[PDB]
Amino acid sequence: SPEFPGKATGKGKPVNNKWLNNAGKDLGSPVPDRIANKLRDKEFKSFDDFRKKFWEEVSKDPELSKQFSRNNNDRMKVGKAPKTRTQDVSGKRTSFELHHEKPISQNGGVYDMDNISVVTPKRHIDIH
Ligand SMILES: [Cl-]
Ligand SMILES: [Zn+2]
């Protein structure tokens, strides 16, 4: 179902300068409220379309962008996830991933930003 369109909803959460520090534990990091404000009520053709726009908006956020290296900003500018610490990769999965907290399977919203978290590839697996 992430291969089909819909409209982003949700509020996201307040975040600070240590956004993504805990993406490798628990249920990961929330969608920042500031980013949710940019994406809410917009239409997306696919979840990949959403993910690209999500990271693009991160790169344009003055608070979030300064938490990342120039190359990671360059990735996010074109919709690519920033790279994780080396210790948090799994195989060829080397950049942060988006996770649905209530699974798509159980009617968790695909584009519900209050159902989406940011996780390391390593942590993502464990939740699955
Ligand atoms: Cl809502
Ligand atoms: Zn997941």
Curated annotation (Swiss-Prot):
Bias (Basic and acidic residues) ranges: 90-103
Region entry Disordered, spans: 61-112
Molecular function in Gene Ontology: endonuclease activity; metal ion binding
Keywords: Antibiotic, Antimicrobial, Bacteriocin, Endonuclease, Hydrolase, Metal-binding, Nuclease, Plasmid, Zinc
GO CC, one annotated term: extrachromosomal circular DNA
Domain of life: Bacteria
Gene Ontology terms describing biological process: defense response to bacterium; killing of cells of another organism
Binding site for Zn(2+): 99, 124, 128
Role according to the record: This plasmid-coded bactericidal protein is an endonuclease active on both single- and double-stranded DNA but with undefined specificity. Colicins are polypeptide toxins produced by and active against E.coli and closely related bacteria.
Record family assignment: Belongs to the colicin/pyosin nuclease family.
Listed name of the protein: Colicin-E7
Native species: Escherichia coli
Location of this fragment in the whole protein: 450 to 573 of 576
